[PDB]
Amino acid sequence: AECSSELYTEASGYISSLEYPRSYPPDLRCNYSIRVERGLTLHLKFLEPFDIEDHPEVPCPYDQLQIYANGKNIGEFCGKQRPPDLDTSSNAVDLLFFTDESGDSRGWKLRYTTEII
Ligand SMILES: [Ca+2]
Ligand code: NA
Numbered sequence: 001a002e003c004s005s006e007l008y009t010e011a012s013g014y015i016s017s018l019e020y021p022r023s024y025p026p027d028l029r030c031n032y033s034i035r036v037e038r039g040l041t042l043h044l045k046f047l048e049p050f051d052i053e054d055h056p057e058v059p060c061p062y063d064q065l066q067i068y069a070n071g072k073n074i075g076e077f078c079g080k081q082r083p084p085d086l087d088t089s090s091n092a093v094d095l096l097f098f099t100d101e102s103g104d105s106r107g108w109k110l111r112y113t114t115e116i117i
Pocket of ligand 2: 021023025
């Protein structure tokens with residue numbers, strides 16, 4: 001399908017993979033950025049279903065969701081168990097979603113909210 005970068009600057013919102021909760025497209029390199037005002041911190045909560053194609057022995061060899069908080073890597077995620085809720089201590093988050101050439105997985109969706117410092 002697509003995948004231009006997306007930018008979210010409201011105090012809360014939803015972010016999901018393309019066509020959620022139907023299969024996300026292959027060969028994606030998607031960048032989602034959240035930028036809110038200094039003195040707010042971002043909290044991320046994934047919803048169910050969460051389904052990124054995985055592998056029984058290799059960590060995330062096929063498709064990957066990577067999360068950055070002000071440039072620092074705070075996790076790479078795949079599989080069927082959603083990540084735990086993330087308190088990022090940051091006003092700047094980036095999610096990078098990479099997908100390979102095949103598979104039918106339902107993808108991911110999160111809600112972010114902001115905490116007042
Ligand atoms: Ca795949
Ligand atoms: Na999807």
